[PDB]
Amino acid sequence: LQSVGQIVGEVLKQLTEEKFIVKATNGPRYVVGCRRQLDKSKLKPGTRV
Amino acid sequence: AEVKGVCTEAGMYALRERRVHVTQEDFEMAVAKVMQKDSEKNMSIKKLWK
Amino acid sequence: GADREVQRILLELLNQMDGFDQNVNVKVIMATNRADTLDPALLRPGRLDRKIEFPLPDRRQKRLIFSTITSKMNLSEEVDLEDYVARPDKISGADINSICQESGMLAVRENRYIVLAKDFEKAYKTVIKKDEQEHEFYK
Amino acid sequence: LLKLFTTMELMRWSTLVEDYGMELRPATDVFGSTEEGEKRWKDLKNRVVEHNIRIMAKYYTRITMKRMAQLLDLSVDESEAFLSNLVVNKTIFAKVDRLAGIINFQRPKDPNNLLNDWSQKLNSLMSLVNKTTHLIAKEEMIHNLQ
Amino acid sequence: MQSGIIHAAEEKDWKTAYSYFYEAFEGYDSIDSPKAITSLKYMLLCKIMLNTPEDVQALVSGKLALRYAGRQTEALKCVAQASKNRSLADFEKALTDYRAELRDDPIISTHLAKLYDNLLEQNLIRVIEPFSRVQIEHISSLIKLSKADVERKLSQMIL
Amino acid sequence: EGTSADREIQRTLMELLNQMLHRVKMIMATNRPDTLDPALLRP
Amino acid sequence: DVLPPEADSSIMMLTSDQKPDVMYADIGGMDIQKQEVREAVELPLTHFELYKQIGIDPPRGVLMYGPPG
């Protein structure tokens, strides 16, 4: 009940430390922010998100 | 294009000796380098046709 | 169809390397194992104005390669790299590296970190790999 | 022995040898004195010296070479050589003024670092006084109810 | 030999310099010409300058480099051992002992002098790192040189 | 100058050759070494 | 706000991770090839004033051909 599904996409460019250009597969491409508990270094182009 | 490459290679040879010169020697060497024709050397395939 | 698509790839490459909209500071390097088959238009001073050749190592280059590889490597005092360098063959850099590498593994299996001349001789034979059984009438 | 080598205090090698030399007088190594390959006694002496160096570097800023030697149980020159070897190995930081023998462990003090330390002291003071005023408010605000 | 000399002098490609010197040595040995000991000396000098003196003795104990053995290779052996031990005093002792071979020959003397200066610089750095104020006398005693020479070298380094 | 399919196969070889880096060991299996490309057989 | 040009390139350059670990010195000999490639793609980008003062378009483009290995 208190869970909701996320949106699968793929990074395209590590923009400014907080901004990531992520292409939602079968859809548009956004610029999005990264939540607190994550490895920005781990996040690299082509990684799923 | 080959002529422009000849000029470029003559300039490159001049640069090789930290120079600002260009001379007949450099131009001739550049011509030889740029027009590197890969011929055939068996001489039999060459002399088939009298 | 497919070969025409390949030709269009080639033509786009030519046109981008030297076309109407000239580039600046976009230096390009390309490597191939067979320079004869390449298109005569993508060999034109202005697009490929160097055409560097990478011949098989000469005696001197063989010596330099052997020195550079046998560095960072414990080596026996009885080894004569001069013999291997002088022996005229067609050994390339990759197979010289393979000679040294398999001599190393032979020594490891022989329980020894300092390779001997027997170990090299073995590696040299196993890399030269001289093909034989050539139907002799050809000679 | 293990307690001494895990506690943070200097132990003089002379006292340790007049205490625990029993080893080989028992066990199988670090012999008090024996065959050359197993007279590691010198290695143990070096370990004691290194532990003393660590303790001094932790708990000093300016130790004269004379005092350092007479505390480490080695000549002044021997201690100088050992300390130089440690410094080269980068295990310890210590700058030796040999003109007056003024061995100093104080790393160069950047003004940035000094003022940052002062500001950190101020921040800790303010947080501590805030917590104390909260606790004392509770204290008086309970007891004066009686 | 000339190509090896040029490579050694100009671009610091000592590997190629040694290669060319060895080619010259093979040629001169095959001819049986007297001008092979110079090539052997230059090969040993290249080996030393490569910061791998351990191989100089191996090369000296070679298949071809035995007929020319003598003071010419003894001097290089002494220089190699001095460099390997980083003993400036023994280095200078070998230089003065074999002044005839190591010195009076420019192509080798200049390189050996440059190596001497570089080694002196490195030793000074190593011995001065564990300090913040030292007596030039103490440094000179540590490094086995003279006070005036160490002072002049230190002044040049500082400048 | 093989056929279009042959050139496609050569391109596939060529891609494999170039892509072929860390802790990825490789075993081949074949009944013929004659057809093998000299570059693909390189040590 | 306009994003930096070619964001979403779909083609990625070499980051610090890739950075092949090979020197100019970890290559036996090859003085000629090293010099040619350096003049083609290194000297023009490092010291361009040297080329300009001579009045040359740097030789952009270089082919490397030879037997495998």
From Swiss-Prot, chain B:
Species classification: Eukaryota, Metazoa, Chordata, Craniata, Vertebrata
Entry's localization field: Cytoplasm; Nucleus
Record's protein name: 26S proteasome regulatory subunit 8
Subunit record text: Component of the 19S proteasome regulatory particle complex. The 26S proteasome consists of a 20S core particle (CP) and two 19S regulatory subunits (RP). The regulatory particle is made of a lid composed of 9 subunits, a base containing 6 ATPases including PSMC5 and few additional components. Component of a complex with USP49 and RUVBL1. Interacts with PRPF19. Interacts with TRIM5. Interacts with NDC80. Interacts with PAAF1. Interacts, in vitro, with the thyroid hormone receptor (in a thyroid hormone T3-dependent manner) and with retinoid X receptor (RXR). Interacts with ERCC6.
Function: Component of the 26S proteasome, a multiprotein complex involved in the ATP-dependent degradation of ubiquitinated proteins. This complex plays a key role in the maintenance of protein homeostasis by removing misfolded or damaged proteins, which could impair cellular functions, and by removing proteins whose functions are no longer required. Therefore, the proteasome participates in numerous cellular processes, including cell cycle progression, apoptosis, or DNA damage repair.
Family per similarity comment: Belongs to the AAA ATPase family.
UniProtKB/Swiss-Prot annotation, chain C:
Family: Belongs to the AAA ATPase family.
Span of the entire protein shown here: 280 to 418 of 418
Location of this chain's protein in the cell: Cytoplasm; Nucleus
Full protein name: 26S proteasome regulatory subunit 6B
Subunit structure: Component of the 19S proteasome regulatory particle complex. The 26S proteasome consists of a 20S core particle (CP) and two 19S regulatory subunits (RP). The regulatory particle is made of a lid composed of 9 subunits, a base containing 6 ATPases including PSMC4 and few additional components. Interacts with NR1I3. Interacts with PAAF1. Interacts with TRIM5. Interacts with ZFAND1.
Residues annotated with N6-acetyllysine modification: 118, 122
Known function: Component of the 26S proteasome, a multiprotein complex involved in the ATP-dependent degradation of ubiquitinated proteins. This complex plays a key role in the maintenance of protein homeostasis by removing misfolded or damaged proteins, which could impair cellular functions, and by removing proteins whose functions are no longer required. Therefore, the proteasome participates in numerous cellular processes, including cell cycle progression, apoptosis, or DNA damage repair.
Curated annotation (Swiss-Prot), chain D:
Cited function: Component of the 26S proteasome, a multiprotein complex involved in the ATP-dependent degradation of ubiquitinated proteins. This complex plays a key role in the maintenance of protein homeostasis by removing misfolded or damaged proteins, which could impair cellular functions, and by removing proteins whose functions are no longer required. Therefore, the proteasome participates in numerous cellular processes, including cell cycle progression, apoptosis, or DNA damage repair.
Protein name: 26S proteasome non-ATPase regulatory subunit 12
Keywords associated with the record: Acetylation, Intellectual disability, Isopeptide bond, Proteasome, Ubl conjugation
Record organism: Homo sapiens
Family statement: Belongs to the proteasome subunit p55 family.
Disease / disorder: Stankiewicz-Isidor syndrome: A neurodevelopmental disorder characterized by delayed psychomotor development, intellectual disability, behavioral disorders, mild dysmorphism, ophthalmologic anomalies, feeding difficulties, deafness, and variable congenital malformations of the cardiac and/or urogenital systems.
Residues of the full protein shown: 305 to 456 of 456
GO terms for biological process, alphabetical: proteasome-mediated ubiquitin-dependent protein catabolic process
Limits of the PCI domain: 1-110
Residue numbers carrying N6-acetyllysine: 58
Assigned GO CC terms: cytoplasm; cytosol; extracellular exosome; extracellular region; ficolin-1-rich granule lumen; membrane; nucleoplasm; proteasome accessory complex
From Swiss-Prot, chain G:
Coiled-coil region(s): none
Location in or out of the cell: Cytoplasm; Nucleus
Subunit structure: Component of the 19S proteasome regulatory particle complex. The 26S proteasome consists of a 20S core particle (CP) and two 19S regulatory subunits (RP). The regulatory particle is made of a lid composed of 9 subunits, a base containing 6 ATPases including PSMC4 and few additional components. Interacts with NR1I3. Interacts with PAAF1. Interacts with TRIM5. Interacts with ZFAND1.
Record family assignment: Belongs to the AAA ATPase family.
Role description: Component of the 26S proteasome, a multiprotein complex involved in the ATP-dependent degradation of ubiquitinated proteins. This complex plays a key role in the maintenance of protein homeostasis by removing misfolded or damaged proteins, which could impair cellular functions, and by removing proteins whose functions are no longer required. Therefore, the proteasome participates in numerous cellular processes, including cell cycle progression, apoptosis, or DNA damage repair.
Record protein name field: 26S proteasome regulatory subunit 6B
